Amino acid sequence: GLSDGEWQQVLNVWGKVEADIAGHGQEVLIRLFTGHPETLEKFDKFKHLKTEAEMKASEDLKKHGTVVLTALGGILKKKGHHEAELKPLAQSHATKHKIPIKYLEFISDAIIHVLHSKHPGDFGADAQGAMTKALELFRNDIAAKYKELGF
Template identity: 30%
Template sequence: MLTADEKQLVLHAWDKVQGHQEDFGAEALERMFTTYPSTKTYFPHFDLHHDSEQVRHHGKKVVTALGNAVHHMDTLSKTLSDLSDLHAYNLRVDPVNFKLLSHCFQVVLAVHLRDEYTPQLHVAFDKFMEAVCNVLTEKYR
């Protein structure tokens, strides 16, 4: 679980994401599709080329959902329940993909935040993303 200080680090970093949700989300998805090509199988109907409108739109949805989670860290299960249901029961996404996207999103943060993405922020954000991944996969059990 995140400490109070770690929660503040995540919240402060999220302020830097505001206004860039579509860009950061698309970049994370493109990075995931390139680095882990098997993840493309869940998007057969998408144009997966660089800067595709579909990838940008979905990236924004992903990062908007993460922002909702950031602002409700103490109630993640409730906050992400609908997304957990959707991915487990309807989309049947392999749970490992959440961790892959988490890693890619953290790389995007590190690239854009540069020196502000300190080791302490990395640890805090990693813990936060792990908690998000755990909630998104709890319906699979």
């Protein structure tokens, strides 16, 4: 898992996201959809978005960005004690949304990219290390639930 020091870094970095949850959420999703168009196809409500300009101008995309990062933030603040929070997400994403674990890798990478893009020079090597460990823990615990479901 993560050390106390590493969790402290994770939640310090997360303060950046919390100051503009919608903007961070929007950019993470645009980074995901533009880097991996196949992911857009998993959202019936976003597949109409043909261009990044349309994505940027979509208020519903920003709304979903807020939902996604709010859920993640909740999970992170549990500092690994997140079984109850993670279980329903693993289930909905495997069974209902049919999201391969690879796409969770993509969005983890997107979060790291957006943090650098929005805070260049203010996302230090230790911070990236800790946030990356937290996102891997998230992904690893989700993967365990995916395997249970055979997904």
